[PDB]
Write an enzyme that holds these catalytic residues in place. Sequence first.
Site, mmCIF file in Angstrom:
data_model
loop_
_atom_site.group_PDB
_atom_site.id
_atom_site.type_symbol
_atom_site.label_atom_id
_atom_site.label_comp_id
_atom_site.label_asym_id
_atom_site.label_seq_id
_atom_site.Cartn_x
_atom_site.Cartn_y
_atom_site.Cartn_z
ATOM 1 N N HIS A 1 15.485 21.711 36.673
ATOM 2 C CA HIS A 1 14.455 21.165 37.560
ATOM 3 C C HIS A 1 13.421 22.205 38.291
ATOM 4 C CE1 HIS A 1 16.617 17.256 37.817
ATOM 5 N NE2 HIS A 1 17.767 18.011 37.425
ATOM 6 N N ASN B 1 19.284 11.018 40.444
ATOM 7 C CA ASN B 1 18.273 11.376 39.243
ATOM 8 C C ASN B 1 17.899 9.799 39.160
ATOM 9 O OD1 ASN B 1 18.503 13.857 38.348
ATOM 10 N ND2 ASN B 1 20.168 13.528 37.021
ATOM 11 N N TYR C 1 25.636 24.810 43.400
ATOM 12 C CA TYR C 1 24.392 24.611 44.169
ATOM 13 C C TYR C 1 24.576 25.615 45.428
ATOM 14 C CZ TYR C 1 22.869 20.387 41.998
ATOM 15 O OH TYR C 1 22.399 19.390 40.799
HETATM 16 C C1 HEM Z 1 24.842 13.694 37.690
HETATM 17 C C2 HEM Z 1 25.043 15.009 38.336
HETATM 18 C C3 HEM Z 1 23.854 15.792 38.555
HETATM 19 C C4 HEM Z 1 22.685 15.276 39.293
HETATM 20 C C5 HEM Z 1 22.395 13.872 39.771
HETATM 21 C C6 HEM Z 1 21.786 16.255 39.160
HETATM 22 C C7 HEM Z 1 20.395 16.515 39.677
HETATM 23 C C8 HEM Z 1 19.695 17.638 40.389
HETATM 24 C C9 HEM Z 1 18.519 17.477 40.988
HETATM 25 C C10 HEM Z 1 17.671 16.581 41.563
HETATM 26 C C11 HEM Z 1 18.272 18.920 41.021
HETATM 27 C C12 HEM Z 1 16.827 19.413 41.762
HETATM 28 C C13 HEM Z 1 17.117 19.439 43.132
HETATM 29 C C14 HEM Z 1 15.622 19.643 44.011
HETATM 30 O O1 HEM Z 1 15.025 18.753 44.331
HETATM 31 O O2 HEM Z 1 15.500 20.854 44.288
HETATM 32 C C15 HEM Z 1 19.169 19.700 40.473
HETATM 33 C C16 HEM Z 1 19.323 21.188 40.349
HETATM 34 C C17 HEM Z 1 20.491 21.880 40.021
HETATM 35 N N1 HEM Z 1 21.355 21.568 39.217
HETATM 36 FE FE1 HEM Z 1 21.925 19.539 39.197
HETATM 37 N N2 HEM Z 1 22.268 17.604 38.661
HETATM 38 C C18 HEM Z 1 23.834 17.234 38.144
HETATM 39 C C19 HEM Z 1 24.545 17.778 37.533
HETATM 40 C C20 HEM Z 1 24.630 19.254 37.551
HETATM 41 C C21 HEM Z 1 25.745 20.098 37.306
HETATM 42 C C22 HEM Z 1 27.008 19.445 36.578
HETATM 43 C C23 HEM Z 1 25.669 21.304 37.800
HETATM 44 C C24 HEM Z 1 26.649 22.485 37.340
HETATM 45 C C25 HEM Z 1 27.657 22.783 37.847
HETATM 46 C C26 HEM Z 1 24.227 21.200 38.037
HETATM 47 C C27 HEM Z 1 23.543 22.304 38.631
HETATM 48 C C28 HEM Z 1 22.375 22.568 39.250
HETATM 49 C C29 HEM Z 1 21.907 23.580 39.870
HETATM 50 C C30 HEM Z 1 22.441 25.165 39.875
HETATM 51 C C31 HEM Z 1 20.501 23.443 40.421
HETATM 52 C C32 HEM Z 1 19.519 24.141 41.101
HETATM 53 C C33 HEM Z 1 19.634 23.721 42.607
HETATM 54 C C34 HEM Z 1 18.475 24.912 43.386
HETATM 55 O O3 HEM Z 1 18.228 25.827 42.837
HETATM 56 O O4 HEM Z 1 18.442 24.695 44.511
HETATM 57 N N3 HEM Z 1 23.755 20.003 38.098
HETATM 58 N N4 HEM Z 1 20.190 18.938 39.949
#
Ligand code: HEM
EC number: 1.11.1.6
Lengths: 197, 681, 681, 49, 144, 49
Positions: free
Chosen positions: B67, B140, B354
């Site tokens: 993202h 999402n 996160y």
């Molecule tokens: C259905 C589950 C998930 C949803 C709804 C989702 C949604 C999101 C969203 C919206 C963001 C952007 C956040 C923002 O607006 O700055 C993001 C970033 C991210 N996601 Fe997920 N994601 C999912 C699954 C995962 C999984 C399984 C992992 C790994 C364990 C993951 C790891 C990350 C990381 C490391 C970021 C960067 C956060 C940051 O740099 O602040 N995500 N995700």
Amino acid sequence: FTEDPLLQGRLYSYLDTQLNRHRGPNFEQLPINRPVSGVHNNHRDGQGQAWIHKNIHHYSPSYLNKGYPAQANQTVGRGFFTTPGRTASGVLNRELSATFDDHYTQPRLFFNSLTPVEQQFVINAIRFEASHVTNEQVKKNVLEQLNKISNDVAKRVAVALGLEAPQPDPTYYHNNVTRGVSIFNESLPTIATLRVG
Amino acid sequence: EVDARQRLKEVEVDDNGQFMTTDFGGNIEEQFSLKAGGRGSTLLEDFIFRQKLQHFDHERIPERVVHARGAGAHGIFTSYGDWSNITAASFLGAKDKQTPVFVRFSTVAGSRGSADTARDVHGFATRFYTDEGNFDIVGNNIPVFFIQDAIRFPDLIHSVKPSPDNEVPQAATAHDSAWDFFSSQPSALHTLFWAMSGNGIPRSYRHMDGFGIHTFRLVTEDGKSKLVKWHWKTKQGKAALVWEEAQVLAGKNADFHRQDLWDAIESGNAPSWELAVQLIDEDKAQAYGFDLLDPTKFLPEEFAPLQVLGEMTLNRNPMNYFAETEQISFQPGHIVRGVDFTEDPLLQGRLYSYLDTQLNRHRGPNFEQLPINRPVSGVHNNHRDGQGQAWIHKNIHHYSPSYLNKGYPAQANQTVGRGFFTTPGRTASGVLNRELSATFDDHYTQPRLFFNSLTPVEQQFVINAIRFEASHVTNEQVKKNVLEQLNKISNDVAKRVAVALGLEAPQPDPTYYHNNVTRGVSIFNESLPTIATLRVGVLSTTKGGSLDKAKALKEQLEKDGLKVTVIAEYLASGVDQTYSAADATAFDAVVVAEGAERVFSGKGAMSPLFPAGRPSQILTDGYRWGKPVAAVGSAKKALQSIGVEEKEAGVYAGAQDEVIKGVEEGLKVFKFLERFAVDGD
Amino acid sequence: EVDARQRLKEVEVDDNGQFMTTDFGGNIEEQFSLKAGGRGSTLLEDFIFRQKLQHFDHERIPERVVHARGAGAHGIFTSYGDWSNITAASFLGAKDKQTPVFVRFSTVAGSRGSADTARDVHGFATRFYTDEGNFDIVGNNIPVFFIQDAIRFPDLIHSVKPSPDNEVPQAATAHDSAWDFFSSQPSALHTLFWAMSGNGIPRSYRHMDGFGIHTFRLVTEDGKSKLVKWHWKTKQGKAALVWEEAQVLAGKNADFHRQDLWDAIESGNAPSWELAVQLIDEDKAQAYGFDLLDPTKFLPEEFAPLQVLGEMTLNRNPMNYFAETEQISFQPGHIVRGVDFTEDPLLQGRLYSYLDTQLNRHRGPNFEQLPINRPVSGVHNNHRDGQGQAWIHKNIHHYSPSYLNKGYPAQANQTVGRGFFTTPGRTASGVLNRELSATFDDHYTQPRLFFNSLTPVEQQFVINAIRFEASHVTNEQVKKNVLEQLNKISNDVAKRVAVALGLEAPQPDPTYYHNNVTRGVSIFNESLPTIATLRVGVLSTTKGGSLDKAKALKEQLEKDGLKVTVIAEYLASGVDQTYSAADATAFDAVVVAEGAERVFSGKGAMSPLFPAGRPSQILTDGYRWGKPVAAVGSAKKALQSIGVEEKEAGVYAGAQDEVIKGVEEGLKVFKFLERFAVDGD
Amino acid sequence: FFIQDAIRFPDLIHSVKPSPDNEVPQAATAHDSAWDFFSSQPSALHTLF
Amino acid sequence: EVDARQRLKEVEVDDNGQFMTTDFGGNIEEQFSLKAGGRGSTLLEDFIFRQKLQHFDHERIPERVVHARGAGAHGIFTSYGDWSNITAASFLGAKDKQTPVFVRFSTVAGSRGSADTARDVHGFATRFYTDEGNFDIVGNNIPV
Amino acid sequence: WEEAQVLAGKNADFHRQDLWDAIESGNAPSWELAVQLIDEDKAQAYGFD
Ligand code: HEM
Ligand code: HEM
Ligand code: HEM
Ligand SMILES: *[C@@H]1O[C@H](CO)[C@@H](O)[C@H](O)[C@H]1NC(C)=O
Ligand SMILES: *[C@@H]1O[C@H](CO)[C@@H](O)[C@H](O)[C@H]1NC(C)=O
Ligand SMILES: *[C@@H]1O[C@H](CO)[C@@H](O)[C@H](O)[C@H]1NC(C)=O
Ligand SMILES: *[C@@H]1O[C@H](CO)[C@@H](O)[C@H](O)[C@H]1NC(C)=O
Ligand SMILES: *[C@@H]1O[C@H](CO)[C@@H](O)[C@H](O)[C@H]1NC(C)=O
Ligand SMILES: *[C@@H]1O[C@H](CO)[C@@H](O)[C@H](O)[C@H]1NC(C)=O
Ligand SMILES: *[C@@H]1O[C@H](CO)[C@@H](O)[C@H](O)[C@H]1NC(C)=O
């Protein structure tokens, strides 16, 4: 190097910016950054140090290391050297030279050295981008500066912006032309790898 | 009437009416390097040059691992009632209780600089700056995710992102590695189908629904809990583009969605969403044909209806994008009293990831101290030091338990200090395992449910999307593996997709086939509740007084709440945009003003001010992309030139008053699906 | 009477009467991990554990590359006059003008945990939070520095710091590589001699003078320049320890100097320094027998006396050591209008080095935004973004020149906006060279000038210091090289150092020998102007009612501003410290209370409460290290047990009134030099 | 190149880079700030062509 | 005669009889700064000065949050027998099976530069460079 | 303790020098790896956990 004020600042900038990107002083140790000629100096430690230096006497001058790694210059060790003839002269100043003053002659020289259709693309490019400017005074300033380069260019660009930048300002107008600035003028020497649908 | 960014005003800096200075004070200039002579070398003692350049050289921080491409804004959430009966959350604990919020929308795979209108799953991250800490619903625009375990997240993201040898393709799943993973890991099929539908290419951030996806817990004061799904319901209505339109828009304007959100808030048309929840008991975990702990499944509204808790409205743009939007650090671990996690294996892993990933982005522990990350409830703990420590702690006894500090800061739990507590009834039982439950095995039933719940034309878009992306796969066996998995979902889908690939689809596999349908998974099916902020392109001409009545047409459309742009050859009096800078993708409806037929025809359509056939291309594209088109008075000849008759639906030819009435009601329909061919004539 | 830390109040956090929270808000408890069962494993979803531990794991930042070991405090500087006719500096702009300050003292080579009383050059970094930007005088307690070119700094520091194979020895120059560098690079010999004298082992930070070392320029508003040397003259007077004392103190109390500075300010006895300067003409740069651009030379006060500018006083200790003292970022590049650099090659390289090294320590370009680093005069520029950006800039047009921002922030120079300007009269001439001037070639004259200006016992301390460190050198040729360089300074010094090494001293080399002497390079020469905050150890006993006399003795001594410590076998009523916890190194004087002779003989000096012969060792150490020692009444037996006559210099015996009067007088003398033997015998 | 002195490099890039309030537009000089700099700093005109 | 540091030999750098170079190669001298005149200011184009000083300025890394003060050495572990009846560990899988090790001893509270002989709990961390991955026994000199 | 205090000031590097000198002089130190094996059901059988 030369006394190009733009070049002078780059020497500092490019070295410093690696500290941000790589988060350490050992970015040169990366396989892609490594030289093939070898590295020998008294640089130790830092983040992500990849080597294990054998010389415990890490300083110069020194009896204990017998003066090694040794100093290299123009006459010995094939070291780097600044051009012997280069000199400095004058007051310490925060200003550019009077020889840097002309900003309009060469732009016109470039425009003169393009083909009729190439000249249209340049104007069409300015026409497109200048129309995205919302502020009216900024567009007037643009045409004012374009008018110094060429009157016809200023007037032609102005019609797309919906206003006049008319009155000629012929301080910098000329008809000189130079080779090799154009792209669409010459033909391609080979058509290898060119795509066909 | 209270400003959403009121707390951030103290850190704002006004540079108007000031002299230039260094970062350590003292007035300076910074337009000339210090040189040794008139044409001399730059001096090392030049402290003004280096302090300026050092800051520039160190401007960039690492983008988000996923993202990376996104945009956001500030707002206000308002609770419709006292929800103490279902949850102990303070921000839902009273009627008319307002909480500041920040929302960031995004894509997924694309890096910083990638297009808004690329086909992808979209982010919907919302923070509640509540009076008991920051609460985040990181979600999402699709209610289900690709994978069932968080350990497989790097495998998913590596496959969808560009190939590591050449870093191609950018912000696209249309390549070998992506479709290798979807076929090899068939749990991803469900989110694939959502991503291939209208949810992959939405009109804007304002026209998206949002989903927490995971089953969470809502806990009351006495410890009793209920399973919950989070839903954001758009008040602007759902809307989606066509793919051929989305591709062109990616190049013409990569900043389509963020500029749309920005222009909406600035024009006084703040978008709003309603916060809704599906509430069910603990004993309904494995009751409705699937496991509630499975993130690849959604709960149909027929089993549990939506219960509206409040409304959020985004009404303040950021003043500095980097400081606010880029630096904000969302976390699903950001939980408050009254809420609790579940044993969803995907959610479980996110709580670690996160918090860890902020160490990379912010290069230190003290990222919560940043103005955008700070809570409004206060921070009191024994955390000391770290990189960029912004505060000065007064308590010299930074430990617990202790006599010297008199038991402060004190411990808080369920009964005392309104502290967080895990649901008391939660239990663990069984062997320690690296396994998934047997209830997670069904990967094909819900994808079929989603496909059945779309309209015939919407079903065509999904198939055409798969056809497009699957054709980019070079490997033959991978394409066969894809059709094999698609056949398990639906034979007809596998048959139709196989036609484009030139392969024979496998024989029917009736294990997972069914004719069930579900409510509210559609888009091009329902009309918009409001046409406010919708864009209209008025094609006019400078020659022959056509621009005068084009301004009258513009004036009337603006009264209904539409954003109008008058197009001409050059920026004359009344002209908003040139034909050179104009495109069909930037409008929801194209209208040809009277007397503007000259630019479609012979002498006039080939002016040097714009590319050849630009006026005609705009109307043609608009019609082929399903947009309500129109042509006032004698401008009906412009429709005749492109080959479009003036009878068919979505085409409005006649007087000025009739065109306005037809165009406005046409915008409610948004896309006219009868112009798109279906398989089988 | 303004608080020096008044700006820092707004970033202070009080946790008293509050519940424990996370870094993102919400009350919690953090004394129990979340477990899956009574004796179960810790859960990954435990956000309370990880957020607490993460901050703990990331507490440490890199120490300073040099001057890692140090301490500091806040204060106020007061100008004695308007100094407009010599400089345009605002903080010296008017009489009685007050400017806040922070000062940090340090050693050089030792790491963060090293001992204060180790022999080394000491730092003296002072910041002025003026109304026209931060001005820093980063200086030392020694007026001259080792090297002449800043490119040689890594070579100097690598040689003095521990050997890179085993990292030995800590905080010490007494090893092969250090003396290999001193002998191989003769320019370092001058600072060596200063380092081997009392300046290497000072009593406290409060008893040190300070020097900017480099020649700077003081520029007036009209643009007239004067060469300047910065001086900090201590109002507490210069004082230093002996080496055998300092070695024991390093182990007994490593925090000796920083605890001393803390207790002085806390007790209300704030230290003070007078800011003085030597003004030299531009044409008198090479007119005093040496080059003023050479940092290895100092200008004798006979040629140019000091002109007192103002006074500094340190009266506020920090609330948090890390946030304030550890995080502060000094730079010689922090210059203001009215001051300018010179062509000293050592200074030129520093300007680059200090700004660069902050990127290492702070991991980002926004280190000036830290509370301790912020100026009080405001910051306005087009610097955006960077790691940990704390502000939100309102100006969207972040560049120049520009119509849209209306030329703001505006440019400021000599005549407009009171902006910084280089000395207008400065020029450059000659070939671009990697050379050092021939005027830098004399390395041996001033070292001899320094040695001649010391007293016979002070000269012996220097030689005894060289004897100690040179004996640690295992390589024989390195020791021969040292004697060769020492011989060039003085033959007598070489011979007297050679005998300890068992080597034959070289033949006289009279090229650089002279008999000139200078003023104010001595320490033990002078008596202290005040005896406040000075320490007296009262040796008493819990038996025979000796505490009554000791308490009355204490009460009297503390009335002259002394910090008195009553010592006994155990902590009885009126006892401050036990014999077990006591040592001679902690006190400036040792007085044996009446009836405390029992603890110096057989039983009494053999108690289980303290190590054998501890009371006698404290008095023996005190006498042997040259401290004023005393014994009230029958306590004369205690002085006789260690073979000390009662009527020699600094030995006082008799009634209570006689002992108190003598010790108070002896503390002004501080150190009695007649107890230290001189060469020949 | 656009500028003559290296100290003006942040000014050049800041103007051509997206507007700091909304980070728009991406990979383009077609906006107010870029052409404000080109007109205010005539040295940039040559590379512009 | 087995060398414990045998694998580390590939990354070792010998500077004996070599000329001075930069970190990007090419021979140099680095004892004089480049000046604009005999008694002139240092030039910004002195790439040799800045590359040398930059590496010095960034030498330090953060010390360990605990056990900052310590010292280590390489060694060899030898198993007295086949311990397959109690553990599947490969390095304890046969008699006379040798594995390289590195041990670092330390105190706890003291920062870098603190004395060795201060009263504290002491560290005893040992790494086993086994044929099936690194195994660390991170321990102390006190059992509780 | 009274020995350790003075040693800390006289030689802060006492232990690392000792370890280094032992290895250089050819007096490498050794330790025997030992283990106390307990059965699973006797985890709380010796008056503690
Ligand atoms: C259905 C589950 C998930 C949803 C709804 C989702 C949604 C999101 C969203 C919206 C963001 C952007 C956040 C923002 O607006 O700055 C993001 C970033 C991210 N996601 Fe997920 N994601 C999912 C699954 C995962 C999984 C399984 C992992 C790994 C364990 C993951 C790891 C990350 C990381 C490391 C970021 C960067 C956060 C940051 O740099 O602040 N995500 N995700
Ligand atoms: C006149 C000679 C010098 C004096 C008086 C001096 C003084 C000092 C002082 C007092 C400090 C500690 C500042 C504090 O209290 O935090 C310091 C640190 C430092 N010095 Fe020097 N120094 C000199 C020469 C040099 C040279 C030639 C270099 C290399 C070009 C250098 C590089 C550094 C660096 C990189 C630091 C650490 C800065 C930080 O981390 O904040 N010094 N020096
Ligand atoms: C149970 C008894 C413990 C023992 C025997 C122990 C042992 C050690 C040792 C020997 C080191 C230094 C390793 C080296 O030689 O580099 C160390 C460092 C460390 N310890 Fe512990 N420790 C214990 C408890 C803990 C606990 C409970 C925590 C927190 C959860 C902790 C956190 C750390 C951290 C973060 C380091 C620094 C590691 C590094 O930077 O490499 N320790 N410990
Ligand atoms: C080219 O034209 C310039 C006008 O700027 C003139 O000064 C110069 O003499 C000409 N040079 C030639 C002959 O090419
Ligand atoms: C909360 O903490 C209090 C003490 O502050 C304790 O008495 C109580 O048992 C705790 N609550 C629960 C339900 O564990
Ligand atoms: C379809 O819906 C019906 C509701 O009548 C339900 O009983 C059934 O389990 C669902 N699934 C399938 C595959 O039939
Ligand atoms: C300073 O800037 C002003 C314009 O603000 C200009 O007139 C002057 O020449 C500049 N230089 C000096 C020496 O003041
Ligand atoms: C020692 O005596 C006085 C200070 O009391 C001082 O003026 C003199 O210079 C010193 N002696 C020498 C030889 O420098
Ligand atoms: C010593 O002092 C004398 C008299 O002031 C002076 O002439 C001479 O230059 C000085 N230097 C030496 C070392 O003789
Ligand atoms: C395992 O076997 C070894 C010999 O291979 C024997 O010495 C030892 O006693 C056995 N250990 C146990 C606990 O059974």
